[PDB]
């Protein structure tokens, strides 16, 4: 549970001194691009149900063993729980790119859910591939400027793909 600003504050307090000037110029540029961060975040957020349905749509086209009887996502209840797990992961990705820090995504999902999927018998590979495909579709949905002014989303495609790869690797 950290912001960007609280991250700089905690680092400056562990140093024990005041915040240096270059960190303040970095935070000024962050405050200039934080809305920029946000535009992707809102256009990412508005299409979330389409994102998770298309992600499960491609995943269960790709691995039909999960839909097959005896598969892990075969049962209707389990399949609803599967879509719930995916939607939760996407929501915490949107939270982490809202606050601009991966510590919220770590705190809320990562440390426990790997052991949860081991204990449940859930294959970590399929949900890792699903989070990867969902992240690819999310950047693909974010990067297209439909009715939006001309700007630069470079570094924020960098950050969003970082968050999605952190989620997919912590899942394993």
């Amino acid at each position: 549970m950290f912001d960007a600003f609280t991250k700089v504050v905690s680092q400056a307090d562990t140093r024990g001194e005041m915040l240096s000037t270059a960190q303040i110029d970095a935070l000024s540029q962050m405050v200039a691009e934080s809305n920029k961060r946000l535009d992707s975040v809102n256009r990412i957020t508005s299409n979330a149900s389409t994102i998770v349905s298309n992600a499960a749509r491609s995943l269960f086209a790709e691995q039909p063993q999960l839909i097959a009887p005896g598969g892990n996502a075969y049962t209707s209840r389990r399949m609803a729980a599967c879509l719930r797990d995916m939607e939760i992961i996407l929501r915490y990705v949107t939270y982490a790119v809202f606050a601009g820090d991966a510590s919220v995504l770590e705190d809320r999902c990562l440390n426990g859910l790997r052991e949860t999927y081991l204990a449940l018998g859930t294959p970590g590979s399929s949900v890792a591939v699903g989070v990867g495909k969902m992240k690819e579709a999310a950047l693909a949905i974010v990067n297209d400027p439909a009715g939006i002014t001309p700007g630069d989303c470079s570094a924020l495609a960098s950050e969003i793909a970082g968050y999605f790869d952190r989620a997919a690797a912590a899942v394993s």
Partner: protein
Amino acid sequence: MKTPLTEAVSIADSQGRFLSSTEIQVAFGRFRQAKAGLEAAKALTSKADSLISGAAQAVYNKFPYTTQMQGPNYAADQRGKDKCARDIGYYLRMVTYCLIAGGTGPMDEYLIAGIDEINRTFELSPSWYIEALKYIKANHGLSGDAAVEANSYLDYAINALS
């Protein structure tokens, strides 16, 4: 760590929903705040050492007994003055940290949460720190809306003290 973006994420997480336009309103407001608050924090960083010494001298002026009586809680000896001005600089650094963070979170986590029992155990009067914070909020020399919210954070520290 009560900062606006963190608490917006906490609201959206406890509700179990995605982010809405409410958090984006919170965000354009937070960026509006930080757009002056970061420069005001830099200005306080510049004037910090003289403000610390002036606050310590005003505290010695209003409470002259602390310089006189022998006691390890009082700043009669030199180590009391070193530790004393150290916690003056602690208070000022927490003010700058809350100016950067945009909320009362850093002072609430680094200062406020145990200050009452510490002043109870160590025989420190909180009125000394109230006098020092009053001198700081009088002498910080900012202007405008940055000055008003700086005074807001210092007054919050005062109300948390007594």
